[PDB]
Amino acid sequence: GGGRYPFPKDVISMTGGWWANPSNWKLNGLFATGIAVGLALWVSTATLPYTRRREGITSESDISKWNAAAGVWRERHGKISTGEAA
Amino acid sequence: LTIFFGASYVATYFVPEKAAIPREFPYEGLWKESGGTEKSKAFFGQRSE
Amino acid sequence: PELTPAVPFFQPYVLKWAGVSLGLVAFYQFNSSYEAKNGHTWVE
C-alpha cells in the first residue's frame, strides 16, 4: 500500500496489528455478521419482557389508596408536614 | 480574574430598573400544587397574584 | 488495498469463551424452565 513501512510479523495482537487485511476476510466477515445479528436478535427478544412504558401501568386508584395509607401512617405516628412547625 | 470579577461587581450598580413585575399565579401562589398544607405556604408558596 | 496472510476465525479463545458463556446462559435458562415446571431449580 501507500505510506507503508516494515513491521515485525511475529507481533500478534487481538486487534489487527499493522494494516491487517487477511485474504479470507469475506468468509470471516460473514461469520461475524451472523454472530452479531444473532446476538442482537437474542438480546432484543429476551429483553422485551423487561420493557415498560412510564405511564399507564398503575391505576390512579392504586395511587390514591397508597397516598391515603401514607396519610393514615403519618397521623398514626403523629407527624406534621414540612414547614408547619413555624 | 480580579479585573473580571471586580468589573462584574461594579457593573451591578449601573443596572437599569425592570419594566414589568414578576409573573404571578392564581391560587394564592400555587402552594397546594407545589406541596403545601395551609401552614407551609411560606416555604412552598409562589408569588402572590 | 494490500492483503495479509489468512487467519482462521474460530481460534481457541473464541471457542472457549463463547462456549462457556453460552453454556452458562443455557444452564441459567434451563434452571428457570425447571422452576417453571417444578418448585425448585435443578441446582437447589
Add this chain to the structure above:
Amino acid sequence: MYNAISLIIILPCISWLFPLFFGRQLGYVFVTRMTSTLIIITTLITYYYFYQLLGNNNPINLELFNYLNIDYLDINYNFEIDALTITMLLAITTISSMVHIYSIGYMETDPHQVRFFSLLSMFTFWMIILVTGSNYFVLFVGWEFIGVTSYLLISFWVTRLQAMKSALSAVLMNRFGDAFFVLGLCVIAYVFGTLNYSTIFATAYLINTDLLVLIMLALFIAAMAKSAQFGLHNWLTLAMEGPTPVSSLLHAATLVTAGIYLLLRSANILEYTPTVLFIILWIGALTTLSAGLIAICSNDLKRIIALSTMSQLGMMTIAIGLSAYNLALFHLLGHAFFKALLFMSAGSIIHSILNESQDIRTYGGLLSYLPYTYICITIASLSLMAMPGLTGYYTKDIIIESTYGSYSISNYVVYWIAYLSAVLTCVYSMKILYLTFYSNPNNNTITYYNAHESNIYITLPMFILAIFAMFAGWILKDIYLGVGTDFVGTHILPNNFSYFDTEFSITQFYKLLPLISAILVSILIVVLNEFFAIVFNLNNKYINTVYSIFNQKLVSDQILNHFIIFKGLVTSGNIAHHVDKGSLYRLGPVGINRLLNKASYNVINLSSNTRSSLSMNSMLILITIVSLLLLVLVMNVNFIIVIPVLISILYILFS
C-alpha cells in the same frame, strides 16, 4: 422482536467488542464498514424513537438485573429514553455515524484503524449508557468509561510523548471531577437513601437547602471538569493531539456535553439550590469570554475550534444558571452538528497541505483550490456566529436575550459578557476564513500544486451536517423553545420562569445589537486584514505581551503546571524522602540500629581491662552491693528521687 432501547444499547457494544475479538481475522476494511453500519442503524432507530416520542411522549424503560441491595441502598441496571435523553442521543448517534464514515477516508494509510474504530464505538456505547441510565450510578459508569475512552483515543498515537501527556492531563483532570462526583453520590445515598431519579426528584423539594447545595456543588465541579469550564479547562486544548475525528466526536460535541447533561438531569434539584445556579452562571460567563479572548490570539486551527466549543459550553451553562434548561439543551444539539462540521472541515484542510500543517499562518489562498470545504466551513461558522435562518440564531440568540429577560437584576451584566463573546466568535471565525481562504499565499508553490479536495467518505458527512446546521434549529424550535411545549418536562419553579418576559421585554437595541454587531465586526475584520493589515502587525511590545498572554491560554497552563502539579510533586518527594524514608526509618530500622550499636558497644566495653579479670569483677560486686544499699535507702526516704538515679545509671551503662 423489536426493542428500540435494547437495540440502541447493544449494537454499539457489538461495534466496540467484535473488532477487539476478531480484528486480526476481519481486517480494517470490514471493521470500518461494520462499525459504520451498526452506528447507522442505531441512528435510524433513534430517529424513529424520536418521532414516536413527539407523537406520544410515554418513555420506554428497561429494568434489568440488580447491582446492589444491601441496607436501604437499592441500585439496579435500569435504563430509560426520555425527551432529554433522546435529544442527547440524536446528537451522539448522528455525530458518531458521521465521524465513523469520515474516519474511513481520514485514517486510511494508518496501520491501526481497527483499534481506532473500536474505540470510537466504545465512546458511543458508553455515552449512550451515560444518557440512558435511570440512576446516577449508571451515569457514573458511563462517565468513567468515557474518560477511559478519551484517554485511549487521545493516546491513540502511542509513540508521541506529547499525546500521552495530553491524555494523562485529560484523565486526571477528569478524575478530579469524578472524585467530587463520588462525594455527591455518597451524599445522595445518605440523604435520599437511593440513587434513582424517580425518588430524588420526587423528594427534592423537601430537603434542606444546605445538603442540596453540597450535592450540586460536587456534581457541578464534576461537570466543571468534563465541560471544560475555566478552572478545569486545560485538558480540552491538549486533547487536540488526538486525531481530528476524535476531536469531532468527543471534544466538540459529545464528551464535553456530559457535564451539561448532568446539570440538566439534576435541574429538578438545582431549582432548589439558587446559590449553585448563581455559581454556574458566573463560571460560564467567565468561560465564554476568556475562551474567546484566547481564541482570537491563537494560531492553530484545531485549538481555535476547541476554544470555540469551550465558549459555547459556557453559554449553555449561562442558560442553566438562568433556569433556562431547554435553551442549553437545544444549543447542545445544534452545537454538535455545526461544530462537528467545523472539525471535519479543518481535517480536510489539514490533509490538503502536503505537510499536514495546522497553523493558519501557513495556509494562504485555498479558496479556489478548496471550494466545497470553504462553503461547508463558512456554513458552520455562520451557524456559529448566530446569523439569521441558521441553527446558531435560534439556539444562541435566545440565551443572550434571556440574560436581559431574567427576573434577577444582576444578570444584565451577563448580557454584555455574552455579547462580547459573540462579537469575538465573529472575529475568531473570520480570522480562520481569511487566513485560510481569502488571504495571499504563505505556503510554498508545491502545496498549491498538490492541493485537492478529499474523497467521498469525508465530503458526504460534511454535506449532511451542513444540511443539519442549516435546518434542524428551525425544525426543532417549537419543540424546545416554544411557548408551553411540555416536551422536556423539567419542573421549573414558577418564580424562576423568565421566557415569556424574555421574548416580550426585550427592546430593539438589546435584540438587534448582537446580530448587527456580528454583521459589522465580520466585515471590519476582513477589510482590515485585506487593506489595513498593519493594525494587526504593529510590533508593539505592550500589545505583544497581551497577545502573548492570550496566546498562552491566559497563562492558565503555566499556573497549573508550576504552582499545583510541580509543587505537588515536590511535596510528594518531601513525603517520600523526609517522612517515609527519613523520620519513619529513624523511628524505625535505622535509628534503632544505631541506638543498639552504641548501647551494645557501651555494654561490652564496661569490663574494660582483660589484664586482670578478678579485681575488676570483684569491684563490680562491691559497687553493686553499695549502689543497691544506697538506692534502697533512697527509695525508703522517697521513691521519685530514685527514678533519675536509675535513669542516670542506665545512661552510664548504655550511652
Add this chain to the structure above:
Amino acid sequence: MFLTSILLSSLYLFNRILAWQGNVKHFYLFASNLLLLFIVVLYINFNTFSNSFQFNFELFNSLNPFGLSNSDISNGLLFGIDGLSLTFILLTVLLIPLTLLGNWYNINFNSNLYYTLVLAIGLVILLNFWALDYISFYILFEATLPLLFILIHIYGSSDSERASFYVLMFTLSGSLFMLLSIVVISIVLNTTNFINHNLFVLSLDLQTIIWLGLFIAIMVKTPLFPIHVWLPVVHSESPLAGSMILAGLILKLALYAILRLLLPLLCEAQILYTPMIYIISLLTIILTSLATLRQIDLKVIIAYSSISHMGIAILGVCSNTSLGIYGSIVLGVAHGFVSPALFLIVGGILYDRYHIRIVNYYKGLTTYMPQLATYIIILSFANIGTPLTGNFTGEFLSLQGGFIRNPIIGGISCISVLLAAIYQLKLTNKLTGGISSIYMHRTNDVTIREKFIMNILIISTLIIGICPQIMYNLLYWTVNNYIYII
C-alpha cells in the same frame, strides 16, 4: 475403613511420585485444585439462613490430642466457619494454585522447598480463617513469619536479607502487643472463643487498654501510617508467590481480625476510639499515595498502592454502617484479585525478562508487547476504581460509610479517587507509551500461563463488579453483627 489408610495412601503416592519424578509442584497443584473443590462443596452444603458457626471441629483436646473432640469439657483449639470466614477462604483457595503456577518455570534451584513454603503459607492462612479462638488465631497469624523469612531470604531479590528481617521483626513487634491483649482477655474472662465473646461486657477503662494492643497489631499488619514502611521493601524484594500471597491474603487477615476480634468484643472502646482510626486512615491514604508519586521501582509502586486501598477499607470497616462493612469486604476480595495480577506483571513477566524494576529503563512496551499493554491498562483502570469492577463497589461503599460516620473526614478521603489515578496512570502511561526503550531488547509477549492467571483474576473482579450482590448470601448477617447502635 481407616482414616490412616487413606492418608497413608496419599503419603505413599507422594513418596513414589517424588522418587520417580523429582519434583513436588504437580502434586501440590493437584492438592490445590482439590482443596478448592472441597471448599466449593462445603459452600454447597452451607446454610445461609443461620448466623451460627458451621463445620466446627476441635483439635488438641485432652481426651484426643491427635483427633477430634466430642467432649463436654473443651480445652483445645476451636475451628469453624461463618460466611465472613468462607468468603476469604474462597479467595485463599482461588489464589493458592495461581501463586504456585506464577513461579512454574522461574525457580531452578531448590524448587521443592519453594513450593512447600508457598503451599504451607497458604494453608496456614486458610486455617487462620477457620479459627474460632484468640490463641489458634494467634498461632496461625504468627506462624507465617518463619516461612516468609526463609522464602524471602533464599529466593528473594538483591535486598532480600533486609526484607526478610523486616517481615519478621515488624510483624512480631505488633503481634506481641496483640499477645498482651489476648493474655489480658484470657486471664480476665477465663475463656477465648469467637462464639460467645460478645456476651462478656468488660469495663470501658479496660476495653480502652485491650483495644490499644489489638490496634497496634492491626496498624502494623494492615498497614497504616506511620508503620507502613516495611511493606514496600517486603513486597518488592520477595519472590512473586510471596508478594501475591502477602498483598492478597495476609493484608486481609487484619481486616478479618478487626471484624472478628475487635468489633464484637470491645464495642464501647471502638465506638470511643474510631476518630483516631479515621485520622490514621486519612493520613495513610493521602500521604502514601503522594509518596507513590515519587517512586522509581515498579513493584514498589504497586506495593504502596495496596496501602491506600487498605486504608479505605479501614474507613469502611470502622464506620458502624452495614454498607461500609460490605464495602470493606468487597475491597479486600477485589484487591486480592487485582493486586497479584499487577505483581505478576511487574515481578514475573517483566522481571523474568529483564531482571530490573527501575522505571527509567521501561518505555514503549506497546510496540513489541501489546497484549501485556492491554493487560496493564485493564488492571490499572481496575486498581484505580473504575466501575464494573469490585474495586469501585468497595471504594464507593467504604466511603459512604466513612461519610455517614464522619462527613468531613469521609468526604476529604474521596480524593483517593484522584490520587489513585495519578500514581497508577503516571506509570501506565510511561510503560505503554512512547518509543520502545533503547536499554531493552525485544522479548516474547505474555505466555498462555501468565495470560491464564491474569484472565482468571480479571474475570473474577469483573463478575463481582457487575453484580456485587452475589456475595451477600454469605454476608447479610455479617453486615449487621458488628454494628453498635441503640
Add this chain to the structure above:
Amino acid sequence: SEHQRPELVSFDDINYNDHKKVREAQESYTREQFIRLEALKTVRKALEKCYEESGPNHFEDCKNLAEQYLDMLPTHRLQGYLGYQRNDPSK
C-alpha cells in the same frame, strides 16, 4: 418453597448462658429489621410509581408518600443487635 417462619426471641426474656436462645434473639432482631427495610422499599416503590404517573402533579399527589419515606429512612434501617444485647434500657 417451604418458606420458614422462625419463632421470635427477645434478649429481655432469656438467660445469656443458653446460647441457642441468644442466637435466636440475634437472628430475630436482624430479621425484623430486614422486614422494616422491605416496608421502606415498598413505600419507595409506590412513591416512584406515583411520581412516574403524575409528573407535575407529584407535589400534591405523592406528598404523604414522600414525607413517609423521609420519616422512615432514618429509622427503618439496619442498626445491629449488640446495642440492645449489651445494654439494659431499664437502668
Add this chain to the structure above:
Amino acid sequence: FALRAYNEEKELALKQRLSQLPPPGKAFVTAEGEPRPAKEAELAELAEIAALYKTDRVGILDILLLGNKHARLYRDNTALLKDYYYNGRRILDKIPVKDKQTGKVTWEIKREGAEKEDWVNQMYFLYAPSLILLLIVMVYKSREDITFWAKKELDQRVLDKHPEINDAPENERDALIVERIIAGDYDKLASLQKKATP
C-alpha cells in the same frame, strides 16, 4: 498414560548411551554458539534421544510398586532427556517429529501443535470448572438472600392480619398488600424491646 509401560533394559542402556554424548548445555552450541558446529550425525542422535522425552516409559502400577534403584535410574536419565529436548528447542528453534513410515526423526520447524505444557490438564480440567461451579453456586445461593424471605414474610403477615385480600382477584392482591404495608407497622422489633417500655 499406559498402565505398566516400564522396561528396565532400555533405561540401563540409555544411561551410558547418553553419557557418551556431550553435556546438554554445550551440545547444540559447540562453545561457538552455532548449530552448524555440531555434526549432523550427532544432530540426528540428539534428536532421537530428545524425542524419547515425550514417550510413555512408566505407568501408575510401575511407580507404585517398583523399588528405588530403578526409579532413580529413570529420574536421572529422564532429566537429561528433558534438558536435551528443551536446549535444542531453544537454541535451534526446532522440535523433533518422527513422521509416519520412515524410521528417522530430525529437528523440524512445525510448531503449530503437537506440544502441550504439563500444567494444562491440571488447571483447565480441575481448576477452571471448579470456579465455574463456584459461580453457579453463588448465583443460585443468591436466591436465598434475606430480602426475598423478608418480602414473603411481610406479605404473609399482612395476609394473616387481613385474610379478606385472598378472595379478591389474583392480579390485585399485590396493590392491597402494598396499601396495608404503607398503612401499618407489621415489624415486631419494638415487640422485642420489652424493657425499653417504661
